[PDB]
Design a protein around this ligand. Structure first.
Ligand SMILES: Nc1ncnc2c1ncn2[C@@H]1O[C@H](COP(=O)(O)OP(=O)(O)OP(=O)(O)O)[C@@H](O)[C@H]1O
Ligand SMILES: Nc1ncnc2c1ncn2[C@@H]1O[C@H](COP(=O)(O)OP(=O)(O)OP(=O)(O)O)[C@@H](O)[C@H]1O
Ligand SMILES: Nc1ncnc2c1ncn2[C@@H]1O[C@H](COP(=O)(O)OP(=O)(O)O)[C@@H](O)[C@H]1O
Ligand SMILES: [Mg+2]
Ligand SMILES: [Mg+2]
Ligand SMILES: [Mg+2]
Lengths: 337, 325, 311
């Protein structure tokens, strides 16, 4: 692809003698590296950088006004994936973003898997009903996939989504558009993400990725004396997930575990904090926290569950309350803080 | 009086050919015909023309004129009085400023607030310029910018109404949401090669748009902290980028804002948060700010500055944006 | 070549080129009798020509007493404006040598350079040239430093007018600036009111770091050329050159050492190391000074400086 440019024949001959293949190859190196390779001088090396940089992109001017006004041209800035409940959508101001990793962390029995299943079901609805008209990919890491609960949810779906007409519901093939994968190791998870997910995403069979418990293998394979390889693996995984989500305009939902706090990270008066440290926290866009209070349900009788927004570039820190029943996860009206 | 050839940007081949021929000083080739030079040395005539052009390519400003220019050029206010007071008035032009902090502390909010504030009319003490935003993380949301711009417009309208002047009304006639949104230029870089390419293309873009007064690169740690095992190459690229950015800021009278990330340093069985990318990166920036939580408040610390003194202030993030108290 | 020196004609030059004599060294490194047999030139003219060429293009020695007397009234000692550093440096730093200041970020190298420049511009009333490569020079800080030494506005303006500011962001610009300064001083020998006495390079590391790395060798040659330029400026023109450098820790030994490598370690004639006082007791201004290298004092002595009190 280096011959599409306009260079002097001597420069092209020199760069061909240096076994340089593409524009990414030449932009990968530095000025002194190209000086040592091509045996050129600074002005023509600078001109080569000029030409390559202009080749990658240029001549296009984008302003915030265009992003704000041209909604159809930029679906990332204006389109959100619904959660299946009006109250949760109101808490999230529309739903999940279409570009970036969204975390969901909490203690056991908080209700993360139920939310994952509900999102996997709701991603298949038409555009006007909050969906993306596509399937989903589910990756299991700790336990086996709960198929019985999925069958119950698919059966009960017409009774949860009241707004959608029944005729459109009848033609929806819920079970045929969900793909299930199983992973037993860190290397297996990395290989799966690198190979199987892009194939499914490119063909258009799915527009949502659920890594589920991402902390499960890292908690068991890396100790406190091997933080550097763990950080390297986490950075690679996060970079790959972000690249895939940006390329295919599909949300990525990750489920995380918590550890006892036992506050540089802003977790002073909290009992538990998300695991995997700050290296994993640096890769996220929206951070949520689902919690259950067992000391208050002992008085109420019914479980007390809250969903909280820890951090977001466009959402204030707030919370609401929800319940879990046979239909699925549903929010409680008039509880947002 | 004598200038050696080694100090000139020539290719190694032509330079070694000249050295082997017998040429040692720059002035020695100033009286040699290019055809005769090509004949004796053995280079082509194009090479002789290029080297003669290059060799003939290499004002007087005192501290008083520099002080006058510094006084004439303003600062960029952050709408946080304490931060402006400890910074000397605001973010200074012709300098490189770096912001560090833990996730969810408010760096992107500061970037958006600066992008909005750079356009305040000079009648209110602003600079009246435009901003360039380079996003390497996809965290730029237009709705937040709209909220910040609306809050700034309301604040300026209230100030103008309180003053009850005539110049303020004329200045606020053209300070609308559409112009503010249209005076921000947006770029998205998904890799460090793309970031380098955009930074390379920046000077021509700034030559075309001479009213730009702010350049923001929200995120330099992310492109350089993944899938890069050769750390020497990373350091070389970072040093080159820092030199290019300071040269750009000085040449075009801009303000350069960079955001960094925090890592953990493990010593004496204790964990402390330090800025990433190594120790040699600390020399790159001119001003370094660090954001952190103390108990529940957010603190801004002037870690390094060549003109002011180390301090610490309090700020908070409101629905209107970056504020104080 | 024609015009290089008297007694050389183009016919003789071409004839010498015919027998593989091209440069001055080639003509000098030859034999009178052996060369004057292939072409048979003038016998006694060749020795006269070589003597003339040696006269123009060779340095000459000087007796010890002569330059002792010359340097007795030529070398000057310039105070830095800080008493502790003056005592550490033995009443200041001498002209005709290169001084280096090393330290980590926030050590105070720029503050020391600014204080020196202000003191020389006001206390001694002499011209100062400042070379900036990282944007660390501010006029407000210079004005603040000057306000602590005088209160006359005209005096402050006159002192500020004696400091020249030059921006150089790559190695080639710095080399061009230094060569231009050399030429200007060479042309300005007759004048005495306006000649630059002190040259400050804010950071030599900022312009050499991008060129170092890989398996290449161009960066070493360029930095050696820069060192040669600095040495020529310091010695030949009797000036005072001050540069700053970064600090690095050795990976295999854990010892702090100056950056830019072992080749650069030999350049300065005097080195000063700045440090922070163990964190505690150095909350601001309080910095730790040391004499890492010298040629007139034992190495290792330590002193105390306070940046906050200078303003
Ligand atoms: N059919 C159902 N009807 C009502 N509640 C149900 C039903 N099935 C499951 N639940 C509730 O689901 C809760 C646990 O939710 P879930 O399995 O999503 O937890 P989790 O956050 O994924 O936990 P873990 O860390 O163990 O994976 C239980 O407390 C239970 O009350
Ligand atoms: N007016 C002032 N009053 C007190 N201290 C000041 C003042 N101006 C600067 N400082 C101090 O100067 C310190 C930085 O010193 P300086 O700018 O010389 O660093 P440096 O060694 O040149 O750094 P770099 O490697 O980043 O270029 C700050 O930590 C600050 O405490
Ligand atoms: N519209 C809003 N109203 C109020 N607070 C907000 C709003 N949007 C974001 N915030 C708060 O501002 C912070 C933004 O931090 P952020 O800019 O993401 O820092 P970083 O980029 O370092 O993670 C979040 O913690 C969030 O709580
Ligand atoms: Mg579960
Ligand atoms: Mg951010
Ligand atoms: Mg400095």
């Amino acid at each position: 692809d280096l011959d599409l440019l306009d260079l002097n024949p001597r420069i092209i001959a020199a760069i061909k003698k240096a076994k340089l293949k593409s524009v990414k190859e030449v932009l990968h190196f530095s000025g002194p590296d190209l000086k040592r390779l091509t045996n050129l001088s600074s002005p023509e090396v600078w001109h080569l950088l000029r030409t390559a940089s202009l080749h990658l992109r240029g001549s296009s001017i984008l302003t915030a006004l265009q992003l704000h006004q041209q909604k159809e041209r930029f679906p990332t800035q204006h389109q959100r994936l619904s959660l299946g409940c009006p109250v949760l959508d109101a808490l999230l101001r529309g739903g999940l973003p279409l570009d970036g990793i969204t975390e969901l962390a909490g203690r056991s029995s908080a209700g993360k898997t139920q939310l994952a299943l509900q999102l996997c079901l709701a991603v298949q609805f038409p555009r006007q009903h909050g969906g993306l008209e596509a399937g989903a990919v589910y990756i299991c890491t700790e336990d086996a996939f709960p198929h019985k609960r999925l069958q119950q949810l698919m059966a009960q779906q017409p009774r949860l989504r009241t707004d959608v007409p029944g005729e459109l519901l009848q033609k929806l093939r819920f079970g045929s558009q969900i793909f299930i994968e199983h992973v037993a190791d860190v290397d297996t998870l990395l290989e799966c993400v690198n190979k199987k997910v892009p194939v499914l995403l490119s063909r258009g069979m799915a527009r949502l990725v659920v890594i589920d418990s991402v902390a499960a293998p890292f908690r068991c394979e890396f100790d406190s004396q091997a933080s550097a390889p763990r950080a390297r693996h986490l950075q690679s995984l996060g970079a790959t997930l972000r690249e895939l989500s940006s390329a295919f305009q599909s949300p990525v939902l990750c489920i995380n575990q918590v550890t006892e706090a036992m506050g540089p990270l802003g977790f002073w008066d909290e009992r538990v904090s998300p695991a995997l440290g700050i290296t994993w926290a640096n890769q996220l866009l929206v951070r949520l926290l689902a919690d259950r209070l067992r000391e208050e349900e002992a008085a109420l009788g019914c479980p007390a569950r809250t969903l909280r927004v820890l951090s977001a570039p466009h959402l204030p820190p707030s919370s609401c309350s929800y319940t879990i029943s046979a239909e699925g996860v549903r929010g409680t009206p008039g509880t947002q803080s | 009086m004598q200038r050696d050839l080694v100090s000139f940007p020539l290719s190694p081949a032509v330079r070694v050919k000249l050295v082997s021929a017998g040429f040692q000083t720059a002035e020695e080739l100033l009286e040699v015909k290019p055809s005769e030079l090509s004949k004796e040395v053995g280079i082509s005539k194009a090479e002789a023309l290029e080297t003669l052009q290059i060799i003939r390519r290499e004002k007087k400003c005192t501290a008083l004129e520099l002080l006058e220019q510094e006084h004439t050029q303003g600062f960029i206010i952050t709408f946080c009085s304490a931060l402006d007071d400890i910074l000397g008035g605001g973010v200074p032009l012709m300098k490189t400023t770096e912001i560090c902090g833990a996730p969810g502390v408010g760096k992107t909010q500061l970037c958006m607030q600066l992008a909005v504030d750079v356009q305040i009319p000079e009648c209110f003490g602003g600079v009246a310029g435009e901003a360039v935003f380079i996003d390497t993380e996809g965290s730029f949301m237009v709705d937040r910018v709209v909220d910040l711009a609306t809050a700034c417009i309301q604040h300026l309208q209230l100030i103008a109404e309180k003053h009850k002047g005539e110049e303020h009304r004329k200045a606020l006639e053209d300070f609308t949401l559409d112009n503010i949104l249209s005076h921000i230029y947006y770029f998205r870089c998904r890799d460090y090669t793309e970031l380098l390419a955009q930074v390379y293309l920046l000077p021509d873009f700034l030559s075309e748009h001479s009213k730009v007064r702010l350049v923001i690169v929200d995120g330099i740690a992310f492109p350089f902290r993944h899938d890069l095992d050769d750390l020497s190459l990373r350091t070389r690229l970072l040093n080159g980028l820092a030199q290019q950015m300071i040269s750009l800021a000085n040449n075009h009278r801009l303000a350069v804002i960079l955001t960094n990330q925090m890592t953990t340093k493990i010593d004496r069985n204790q964990a402390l948060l330090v800025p990433a990318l190594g120790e040699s990166w600390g020399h790159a920036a001119t001003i370094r700010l660090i954001f952190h939580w103390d108990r529940k408040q957010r603190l801004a610390t002037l870690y390094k500055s060549p003109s002011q003194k180390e301090c610490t202030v309090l700020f908070q993030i409101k629905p209107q944006g970056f504020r104080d108290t | 070549r024609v015009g290089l020196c008297p007694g050389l004609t183009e016919e003789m030059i071409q004839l010498l080129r015919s027998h593989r004599i091209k440069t001055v060294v080639d003509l000098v490194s030859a034999d009178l009798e052996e060369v004057a047999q292939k072409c048979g030139l003038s016998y006694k003219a060749l020795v006269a020509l070589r003597r003339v060429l040696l006269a123009q293009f060779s340095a000459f020695p000087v007796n010890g007493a002569d330059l002792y007397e010359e340097l007795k009234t030529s070398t000057a000692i310039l105070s830095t404006g800080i008493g502790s550093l003056d005592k550490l440096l033995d009443a200041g730093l001498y002209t005709g040598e290169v001084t280096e200041i090393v330290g980590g970020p926030g050590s105070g190298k720029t503050q020391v350079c600014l204080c020196m420049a202000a003191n020389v511009a006001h206390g001694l009333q002499q011209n100062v040239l400042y070379v900036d490569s990282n944007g660390g020079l501010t006029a407000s800080r210079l004005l603040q430093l000057l306000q602590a030494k005088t209160q006359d506005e005209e005096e402050q303006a006159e002192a500020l007018r004696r400091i020249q500011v030059v921006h150089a962001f790559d190695i080639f610009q710095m080399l061009d600036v230094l060569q231009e300064l050399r030429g200007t001083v060479a042309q300005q020998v007759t004048g005495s009111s306006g000649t630059v006495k002190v040259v400050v390079v804010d950071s030599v590391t900022a312009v050499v770091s991008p060129l170092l790395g890989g398996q290449q060798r161009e960066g070493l040659a360029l930095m050696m050329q820069l060192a040669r330029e600095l040495k020529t400026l310091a010695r030949d023109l009797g000036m005072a050159v001050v540069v700053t450098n970064h600090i690095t820790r050795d990976r295999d030994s854990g010892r702090l050492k100056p950056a830019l490598g072992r080749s650069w370690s030999f350049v300065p004639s005097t080195r000063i190391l700045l440090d922070t006082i163990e964190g505690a007791g150095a909350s601001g201004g309080r910095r730790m000074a040391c004499l890492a290298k010298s040629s007139r004092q034992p190495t290792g002595f330590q002193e105390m400086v306070d940046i906050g009190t200078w303003g």
